[model samples]
Target: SDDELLYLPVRGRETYEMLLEIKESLELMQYLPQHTIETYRQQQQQQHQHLLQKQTSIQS
Candidate 1:
């Protein structure tokens, strides 16, 4: 019951927007040449992987 209710459109939209902002900030940070862009890309990939792992854990 709680799980079904949590998937409503309003909550989904808010979560989606917050995630988009995070991605945008990470992308903008890529413009700096102080550190290699590849490093940032790897960090992003790791963060994504962590999120996926957490989601899987929660679902199961």
Candidate 2:
């Protein structure tokens, strides 16, 4: 129940824009969120790192 409710598929540009809209709406209402944007940034950083590692391995 809680797991199903808490988990969401945060994927694709369209979905991202939808969530970004929601985030801004909450901010406009004076609400503070703990962890949506930061988590997304972290995942992007990790993905870049993974790609770099693969490139390095391929070059070797």
Candidate 3:
């Protein structure tokens, strides 16, 4: 099941097997900043809307 996405030029067997057993790509990806960034994007949307109101009025 190890392929290009799960593989790269590495320096150790532990690294190789670790990549080999990942059943889902997100298994590794979840710990990545990608998801956390997305979470920030969503949560920040509210603050984003607030900041936009600095020139106007937004009580909500």
TM-scores, all models, native as reference: 0.32, 0.33, 0.26
Ordered list by lDDT, greatest first: 2, 1, 3
> For model 2, how does the per-residue alpha-carbon lDDT over 1-60 read when each residue is reduced to its tens digit?
555756466778988998889978887655556477778889888888777456444432
Best model per TM-score: 2
Question: On residues 1-60, what C-alpha lDDT tens digit does candidate 3 reach at each position?
Answer: 456565366677887777767835656577656877788889888787767456565454
Q: How many Å off is the CA of 8 in candidate 1? A: 18
Backbone collision tally, model 1: 0
lDDT winner, 1 or 2: 2
Q: On a 0 to 100 scale, what is the lDDT of residue 34 in model 3?
A: 87
In candidate 2, which residue pairs get closer than 3 Å at backbone N, Cα or C atoms, i.e. clash?
none
Cα error of candidate 1 at position 60, Å: 52
- Report the C-alpha displacement of residue 55, candidate 3, in angstroms: 12
In candidate 1, which residue ranges exceed 4 Å CA deviation? Answer: 1-11, 32-60
Per-residue error for 42 in candidate 2, Å, reads 0.6
